[PDB]
Design a protein around this motif. Structure first.
Motif, PDB file in Angstrom:
ATOM      1  N   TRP A  19       0.869  -1.364   0.142  1.00 56.83           N
ATOM      2  CA  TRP A  19       0.288  -0.385   0.084  1.00 56.83           C
ATOM      3  C   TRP A  19       0.715   1.359  -0.289  1.00 56.83           C
ATOM      4  O   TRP A  19       2.084   1.069   0.642  1.00 56.83           O
ATOM      5  CB  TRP A  19      -1.346   0.217   1.288  1.00 56.83           C
ATOM      6  N   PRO A  20       1.049   2.665  -0.875  1.00 59.52           N
ATOM      7  CA  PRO A  20      -0.831   2.831  -1.268  1.00 59.52           C
ATOM      8  C   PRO A  20      -0.917   1.488  -2.514  1.00 59.52           C
ATOM      9  O   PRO A  20      -2.100   1.766  -3.254  1.00 59.52           O
ATOM     10  CB  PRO A  20      -0.650   4.522  -1.670  1.00 59.52           C
ATOM     11  N   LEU A  21       0.312   1.018  -3.051  1.00 56.48           N
ATOM     12  CA  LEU A  21      -0.678   0.351  -4.060  1.00 56.48           C
ATOM     13  C   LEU A  21      -1.971  -0.461  -4.063  1.00 56.48           C
ATOM     14  O   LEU A  21      -2.607  -0.397  -4.672  1.00 56.48           O
ATOM     15  CB  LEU A  21       0.783  -0.110  -4.955  1.00 56.48           C
ATOM     16  N   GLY A  22      -1.129  -0.887  -3.781  1.00 55.40           N
ATOM     17  CA  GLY A  22      -2.573  -2.369  -3.044  1.00 55.40           C
ATOM     18  C   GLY A  22      -2.479  -3.291  -4.179  1.00 55.40           C
ATOM     19  O   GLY A  22      -1.254  -3.843  -4.813  1.00 55.40           O
TER      20      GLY A  22
END
Length: 28
Positions: A19-22
């Motif tokens: 995260w913040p990609l996820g």
């Protein structure tokens, strides 16, 4: 996919990344 300064997700790569990609699913 895209390739931005060592952050390069290949086209077709759909997987989880920190995260913040996820979950990132980039057909391109």
């Amino acid at each position: 996919g895209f390739c931005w300064h060592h952050s390069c997700v290949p086209s077709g790569t759909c997987a989880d990344f920190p995260w913040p990609l996820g979950h990132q699913c980039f057909p391109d």
